[PDB]
Design a binder for this molecule. Structure first.
Ligand SMILES: *Cc1c(COP(=O)(O)O)cnc(C)c1O
Ligand SMILES: *Cc1c(COP(=O)(O)O)cnc(C)c1O
Lengths: 396, 396
């Protein structure tokens, strides 16, 4: 049965981690996967999560199965994080959320749901976008179409091109928007652009699907939710696939949510019963650990205060590294102006390096970036800034 | 988009838990979902797992992403549990395992893999079988066909009917076998019958897929793996979807494995790269908590000794409850011979109650069983044995 199975091509983001491991050189630098690193190049588990874990260890009475949709409090906390505390979606009971294995699991659950319960056949994703989007939607049977986004010459958001590209999108098409900290560009729409987009989609009949994986990494929790709320305020339907992997440093615990909003309570509930059937036929019910950690921290005032500060530290440290990167590039002889980097949000800098420059950096210098030129600024520390910038200016 | 979505029919096993919760009556008894209960009707987290969790809390340095396939040691321990310590599959590097979100997640991963990488279109499942099998395979696009299994009059395994049914199965078809403690009947093949089945499938060209969710609940760990090893010994290819939800009381942590075996190392590896691509497009990488708990317990001699005894206690207590059930049924006036119940393995007794008897028990007596007549003997305690048996003899 398996004789003719061909080998899958390595994952552009995840297979990079394997190469780096297989690397015997001393000063290799990993600017690949989107995992936060502190000043010492470690990825510690947050103090707020260690505390919640101790609490879980003291207080859990059972490992009995959660419901298909997970921990209710987890869902309630997600809705408030996404939509706002006194939100109308919340008060009108227009939203239902299922806890899922990470944001990827939420995107998948959304895909399967749409594929088996609606008339959707096409999903629009930006160019460029997180490389695994195409793959998740293609797995559910939907096709992926691309809309213009980034202007590589000017390193800006080419809004008119975005708009004109999206004009090929039909009524009933799913259009995927990133929350904030666009992966991989770091280029995001202004709020005005978000309102323009919100009125346009309501008018063209698109179903918005938001991939929200970096809430809190640009300006703050409530601020990063602006585009999505602008949308929620005028759409009767939408789905949001959120992740707590990056903002809680809970990467391997697989914590995410897929929230579904419809016109009213009765409709969203009927629609949710199908989402649940889709979950049951996939992984059955979600893993409790990471999500009860998130529910515990979010529900406890002291624990939340500590987490928000840890998230504030992550954000500010990345901001400090961006600056250090553009300055050091200048001091090291990079004769190109990399200052556009100062203008991007999140962990990623779309460097504008060619696929061959990216190949040379890793092959001659052990510096690891995604072939697209995406670099992890959060993976940069003041100790590796110099050798890294020397490697870069040498392939330029 | 969601206006015409119909409500999904409630899950036969999982929606039962909701009804039971919505129930305001005092003495309701839940004999529904396959979750173990101790003499007091609680589902404690095992002492061996609480200890491993403390260790994890003390020793974890990061929550950084696991590989798509998980914790390597988890995979190694699974292979030894399934195939044996000095196994040829292990020594020849013929097997590859991916850690998955539960056994369901493993069945799904297997389905997606087979659907997108082989020429499989049909999966054969027993009649009856775990209700969610059809649903997982149908989700991947495969069709489910049924093979004869249980003789309801004699409450035995109708082996000739099994064999003759399976004759409609073509070369290249997937045939799903349960490890041991067949869900829902508790009726399993003798080892001789397992060897007969192993030679037959090798001859007819079937690809065996084992759902192993109760290893250790019939006779013991190594003993319950007999049928599967009988098969492994003569098949060049097979996939096993195992679960640690029941044998480690780790239900909500979602701990399972999908192991893939091919003719040689090169083939299984090439085949595994596609399994990994399938995982990446679903939930990305698996949740660490439950699996590192399992790896820790399995790798530590003291911790393993304690777990094996806890599993021995679970098994023996269920055995004591079966007996108590048939005796009390006799003492309570159940004029039907329920002694076949003594002959079943695992947590489930296929009672032979009609769908209406099952409806009356829950509606008039608050006793909850699956509509199929499947009862959870592990959910029985000496405190609820009497009112439960009185309810049953009253609907007979
Ligand atoms: C990280 C990420 C995801 C999901 O990651 P999970 O680790 O599955 O939580 C989804 N979309 C984007 C844009 C991401 O950056
Ligand atoms: C419990 C069970 C499964 C899987 O359960 P998970 O909770 O997903 O680990 C699969 N097959 C059978 C026969 C089962 O009893």
């Amino acid at each position: 049965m398996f004789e003719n199975i061909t080998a899958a091509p390595a994952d552009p983001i995840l297979g990079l981690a394997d190469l780096f491991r297989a690397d015997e050189r001393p000063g290799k630098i990993n600017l690949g996967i989107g995992v936060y690193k502190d000043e010492t190049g470690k990825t510690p588990v947050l103090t707020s999560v260690k505390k919640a874990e101790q609490y879980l260890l003291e207080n859990e009475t059972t490992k009995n199965y959660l419901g298909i949709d997970g921990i209710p409090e987890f869902g309630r906390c997600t809705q408030e994080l996404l939509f706002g505390k006194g939100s109308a979606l919340i008060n009108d009971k227009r939203a239902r959320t299922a806890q899922t294995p990470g944001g990827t699991g939420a995107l998948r659950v959304a895909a399967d749901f749409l594929a088996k319960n609606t008339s959707v056949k096409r999903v629009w994703v930006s160019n460029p976008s997180w490389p695994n989007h195409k793959s998740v939607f293609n797995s559910a049977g939907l096709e992926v179409r691309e809309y213009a986004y980034y202007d590589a010459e000017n390193h800006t958001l080419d809004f008119d091109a975005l708009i004109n590209s999206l004009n090929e999108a039909q009524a009933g098409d799913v259009v995927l928007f990133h929350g904030y900290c666009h992966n991989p560009t770091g280029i995001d729409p202004t709020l005005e652009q978000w309102q323009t987009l919100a009125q346009l989609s309501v008018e063209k009949g698109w179903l918005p699907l938001f991939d929200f994986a970096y809430q809190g990494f640009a300006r703050g929790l409530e601020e990063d939710a602006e585009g999505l709320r602008a949308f929620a305020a005028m759409h009767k339907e939408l789905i949001v696939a959120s992740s707590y992997s990056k903002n809680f440093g809970l990467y391997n615990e697989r914590v995410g949510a897929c929230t579904l909003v419809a016109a009213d309570s009765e409709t969203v509930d009927r629609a949710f019963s199908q989402m649940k059937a889709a979950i049951r036929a996939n992984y059955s019910n979600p893993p409790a650990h990471g999500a009860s950690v998130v529910a515990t921290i979010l529900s406890n005032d002291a624990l939340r205060a500590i987490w928000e500060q840890e998230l504030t530290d992550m954000r500010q440290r990345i901001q400090r590294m961006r600056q250090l990167f553009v300055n050091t590039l200048q001091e090291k002889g990079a004769n190109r102006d990399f200052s556009f980097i100062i203008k991007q949000n999140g962990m990623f800098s779309f460097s504008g390096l060619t696929k061959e420059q990216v190949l040379r950096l890793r092959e001659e210098f052990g510096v690891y970036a995604v072939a697209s030129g995406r670099v992890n600024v959060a993976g940069m520390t003041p100790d590796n800034m110099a050798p890294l910038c020397e490697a870069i200016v040498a392939v330029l």
